[PDB]
Scaffold this active site. Sequence first.
Site, PDB file in Angstrom:
ATOM      1  N   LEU A  96      83.308  42.228 -24.601  1.00  0.00           N
ATOM      2  CA  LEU A  96      82.245  42.455 -23.607  1.00  0.00           C
ATOM      3  C   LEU A  96      82.348  43.863 -22.972  1.00  0.00           C
ATOM      4  O   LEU A  96      81.330  44.492 -22.678  1.00  0.00           O
ATOM      5  CB  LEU A  96      82.351  41.434 -22.466  1.00  0.00           C
ATOM      6  CG  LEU A  96      81.583  40.125 -22.506  1.00  0.00           C
ATOM      7  CD1 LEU A  96      81.521  39.543 -21.168  1.00  0.00           C
ATOM      8  CD2 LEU A  96      80.175  40.248 -23.084  1.00  0.00           C
ATOM      9  N   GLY A 147      86.750  47.120 -18.356  1.00  0.00           N
ATOM     10  CA  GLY A 147      87.108  46.767 -16.988  1.00  0.00           C
ATOM     11  C   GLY A 147      88.170  47.635 -16.340  1.00  0.00           C
ATOM     12  O   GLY A 147      87.874  48.769 -15.935  1.00  0.00           O
ATOM     13  N   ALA A 148      89.422  47.103 -16.202  1.00  0.00           N
ATOM     14  CA  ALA A 148      90.478  47.851 -15.512  1.00  0.00           C
ATOM     15  C   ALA A 148      91.921  47.615 -15.983  1.00  0.00           C
ATOM     16  O   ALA A 148      92.764  48.499 -15.777  1.00  0.00           O
ATOM     17  CB  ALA A 148      90.396  47.589 -14.016  1.00  0.00           C
ATOM     18  N   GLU A 194      91.131  44.506 -21.974  1.00  0.00           N
ATOM     19  CA  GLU A 194      89.784  44.254 -22.461  1.00  0.00           C
ATOM     20  C   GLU A 194      89.225  42.964 -21.901  1.00  0.00           C
ATOM     21  O   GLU A 194      89.979  42.059 -21.547  1.00  0.00           O
ATOM     22  CB  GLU A 194      89.765  44.223 -23.991  1.00  0.00           C
ATOM     23  CG  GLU A 194      89.782  45.600 -24.626  1.00  0.00           C
ATOM     24  CD  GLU A 194      90.094  45.562 -26.108  1.00  0.00           C
ATOM     25  OE1 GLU A 194      89.576  46.421 -26.859  1.00  0.00           O
ATOM     26  OE2 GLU A 194      90.868  44.667 -26.515  1.00  0.00           O
ATOM     27  N   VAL A 195      87.899  42.881 -21.820  1.00  0.00           N
ATOM     28  CA  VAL A 195      87.243  41.677 -21.359  1.00  0.00           C
ATOM     29  C   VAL A 195      86.480  41.112 -22.536  1.00  0.00           C
ATOM     30  O   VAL A 195      85.677  41.825 -23.136  1.00  0.00           O
ATOM     31  CB  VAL A 195      86.317  41.955 -20.162  1.00  0.00           C
ATOM     32  CG1 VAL A 195      85.645  40.674 -19.684  1.00  0.00           C
ATOM     33  CG2 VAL A 195      87.077  42.640 -19.033  1.00  0.00           C
ATOM     34  N   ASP A 209      83.656  46.266  -2.059  1.00  0.00           N
ATOM     35  CA  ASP A 209      82.840  46.858  -3.127  1.00  0.00           C
ATOM     36  C   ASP A 209      81.577  46.049  -3.459  1.00  0.00           C
ATOM     37  O   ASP A 209      81.304  45.799  -4.635  1.00  0.00           O
ATOM     38  CB  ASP A 209      83.712  47.066  -4.378  1.00  0.00           C
ATOM     39  CG  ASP A 209      83.199  48.075  -5.384  1.00  0.00           C
ATOM     40  OD1 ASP A 209      82.213  48.794  -5.060  1.00  0.00           O
ATOM     41  OD2 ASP A 209      83.781  48.145  -6.506  1.00  0.00           O
ATOM     42  N   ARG A 232      76.247  46.177  -9.409  1.00  0.00           N
ATOM     43  CA  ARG A 232      77.108  46.254 -10.597  1.00  0.00           C
ATOM     44  C   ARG A 232      78.286  45.251 -10.551  1.00  0.00           C
ATOM     45  O   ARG A 232      78.957  45.032 -11.569  1.00  0.00           O
ATOM     46  CB  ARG A 232      77.645  47.673 -10.776  1.00  0.00           C
ATOM     47  CG  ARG A 232      78.591  48.048  -9.657  1.00  0.00           C
ATOM     48  CD  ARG A 232      79.265  49.397  -9.814  1.00  0.00           C
ATOM     49  NE  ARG A 232      80.006  49.696  -8.585  1.00  0.00           N
ATOM     50  CZ  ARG A 232      79.474  50.280  -7.514  1.00  0.00           C
ATOM     51  NH1 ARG A 232      78.200  50.653  -7.515  1.00  0.00           N
ATOM     52  NH2 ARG A 232      80.205  50.474  -6.430  1.00  0.00           N
ATOM     53  N   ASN A 233      78.537  44.647  -9.360  1.00  0.00           N
ATOM     54  CA  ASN A 233      79.589  43.665  -9.170  1.00  0.00           C
ATOM     55  C   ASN A 233      79.071  42.243  -8.992  1.00  0.00           C
ATOM     56  O   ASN A 233      79.829  41.374  -8.610  1.00  0.00           O
ATOM     57  CB  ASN A 233      80.479  44.064  -8.006  1.00  0.00           C
ATOM     58  CG  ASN A 233      81.299  45.290  -8.366  1.00  0.00           C
ATOM     59  OD1 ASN A 233      81.743  45.442  -9.509  1.00  0.00           O
ATOM     60  ND2 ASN A 233      81.462  46.216  -7.438  1.00  0.00           N
ATOM     61  N   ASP A 260      83.648  40.899  -9.668  1.00  0.00           N
ATOM     62  CA  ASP A 260      84.551  42.046  -9.483  1.00  0.00           C
ATOM     63  C   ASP A 260      85.085  42.277  -8.058  1.00  0.00           C
ATOM     64  O   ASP A 260      84.461  42.984  -7.265  1.00  0.00           O
ATOM     65  CB  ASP A 260      83.930  43.338  -9.998  1.00  0.00           C
ATOM     66  CG  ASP A 260      84.976  44.416 -10.208  1.00  0.00           C
ATOM     67  OD1 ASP A 260      86.115  44.070 -10.613  1.00  0.00           O
ATOM     68  OD2 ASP A 260      84.660  45.610  -9.966  1.00  0.00           O
TER      69      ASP A 260
HETATM   70  C1  LIG Z   1      77.870  38.967 -20.460  1.00  0.00           C
HETATM   71  C2  LIG Z   1      78.118  40.132 -19.558  1.00  0.00           C
HETATM   72  N1  LIG Z   1      77.430  41.304 -19.812  1.00  0.00           N
HETATM   73  C3  LIG Z   1      77.707  42.196 -18.923  1.00  0.00           C
HETATM   74  C4  LIG Z   1      77.059  43.582 -19.027  1.00  0.00           C
HETATM   75  C5  LIG Z   1      77.616  44.318 -20.240  1.00  0.00           C
HETATM   76  O1  LIG Z   1      77.352  44.328 -17.841  1.00  0.00           O
HETATM   77  C6  LIG Z   1      75.534  43.491 -19.204  1.00  0.00           C
HETATM   78  O2  LIG Z   1      74.827  43.143 -18.019  1.00  0.00           O
HETATM   79  S1  LIG Z   1      78.828  41.723 -17.705  1.00  0.00           S
HETATM   80  C7  LIG Z   1      78.936  40.165 -18.461  1.00  0.00           C
HETATM   81  C8  LIG Z   1      79.854  39.191 -17.837  1.00  0.00           C
HETATM   82  C9  LIG Z   1      79.572  37.838 -17.757  1.00  0.00           C
HETATM   83  N2  LIG Z   1      80.371  36.947 -17.164  1.00  0.00           N
HETATM   84  C10 LIG Z   1      81.510  37.385 -16.591  1.00  0.00           C
HETATM   85  N3  LIG Z   1      82.259  36.488 -15.946  1.00  0.00           N
HETATM   86  C11 LIG Z   1      81.875  38.743 -16.622  1.00  0.00           C
HETATM   87  O3  LIG Z   1      83.000  39.108 -15.916  1.00  0.00           O
HETATM   88  C12 LIG Z   1      83.510  40.441 -16.068  1.00  0.00           C
HETATM   89  C13 LIG Z   1      85.001  40.440 -15.790  1.00  0.00           C
HETATM   90  C14 LIG Z   1      82.747  41.394 -15.163  1.00  0.00           C
HETATM   91  C15 LIG Z   1      82.439  40.921 -13.890  1.00  0.00           C
HETATM   92  C16 LIG Z   1      81.711  41.721 -13.043  1.00  0.00           C
HETATM   93  F1  LIG Z   1      81.456  41.258 -11.791  1.00  0.00           F
HETATM   94  C17 LIG Z   1      81.262  42.968 -13.384  1.00  0.00           C
HETATM   95  C18 LIG Z   1      81.546  43.443 -14.651  1.00  0.00           C
HETATM   96  C19 LIG Z   1      82.258  42.652 -15.552  1.00  0.00           C
HETATM   97  N4  LIG Z   1      82.540  43.194 -16.843  1.00  0.00           N
HETATM   98  N5  LIG Z   1      81.615  43.832 -17.569  1.00  0.00           N
HETATM   99  C20 LIG Z   1      82.277  44.205 -18.656  1.00  0.00           C
HETATM  100  C21 LIG Z   1      83.603  43.829 -18.529  1.00  0.00           C
HETATM  101  N6  LIG Z   1      83.773  43.219 -17.364  1.00  0.00           N
HETATM  102  C22 LIG Z   1      81.034  39.640 -17.249  1.00  0.00           C
END
Ligand SMILES: Cc1nc([C@](C)(O)CO)sc1-c1cnc(N)c(O[C@H](C)c2cc(F)ccc2N2NC=CN2)c1
Length: 270
Positions: free
Chosen positions: A15, A18-19, A22-23, A143, A147-148, A166
């Site tokens: 996906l 992150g930090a 990999e996610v 934060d 985006r979070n 996040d």
């Molecule tokens: C399915 C899916 N698609 C995403 C995109 C790539 O941002 C598109 O909107 S986030 C996401 C996505 C879907 N479900 C999650 N539980 C998730 O959690 C990760 C840890 C996360 C949580 C956040 F609050 C913000 C960013 C991210 N990411 N994003 C990439 C790595 N960590 C990401």
Amino acid sequence: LPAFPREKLTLRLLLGSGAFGEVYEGTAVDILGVGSGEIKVAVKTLKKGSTDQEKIEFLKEAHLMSKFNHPNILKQLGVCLLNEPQYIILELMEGGDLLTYLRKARMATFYGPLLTLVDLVDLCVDISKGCVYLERMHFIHRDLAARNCLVSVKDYTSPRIVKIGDFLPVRWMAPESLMDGIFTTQSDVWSFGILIWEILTLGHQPYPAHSNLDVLNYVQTGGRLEPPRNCPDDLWNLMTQCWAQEPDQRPTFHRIQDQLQLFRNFFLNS
Ligand SMILES: Cc1nc([C@](C)(O)CO)sc1-c1cnc(N)c(O[C@H](C)c2cc(F)ccc2N2NC=CN2)c1
């Protein structure tokens, strides 16, 4: 800490980064209980060969997440911390982040946005319920930004739920946070005002004509964001309250939820 057997976890696809590592998007079997079945999850990993300092920070993140149980807060379903690579298993929000969700709604067609005012007011209400929970738990977010936040559906027709995920971003930071490094629930209320301006503008960048360093001064000097186009005055009034120069004059998250709830009821009656 919800210890989970890694044998019941499948990492299906990448996906993002992150930090810590990999996610992935994955599948967890019976992570909700013995009957549950296969449920789609998001797995935050800690790269194999991580230092003790990185493992401790990853453990702290798992500890922080283990405290949240709210419909508007991203939930940690399990952890796999006994071996490397370590995992933090989260619920999968199929819509992805709120900033991308808002931006796509605006840019899909010139007929109009794929989200209406009532969709955007429901998004504000849902995030404010999450913030009321955090204020009640005495958790300072530091934060809050689109985006979070994550959305449960990718389309613009299905019922959707938004959750806070996040747990420098100068454009979202309160004056005291920029000048003295002070981060409280009152500075989170400032960022919430910026986040609802993000929603109502459908993912526009705050202070577009300013640089990051000029934002630092403009905000300390009394300058605020421009009102979103055609923004209801009750929402713009609420946003300017969130941006009071003094943290004590800003409303509480419980008051903000009441204000949003009143506007939603008032508007629906028209
Ligand atoms: C399915 C899916 N698609 C995403 C995109 C790539 O941002 C598109 O909107 S986030 C996401 C996505 C879907 N479900 C999650 N539980 C998730 O959690 C990760 C840890 C996360 C949580 C956040 F609050 C913000 C960013 C991210 N990411 N994003 C990439 C790595 N960590 C990401």
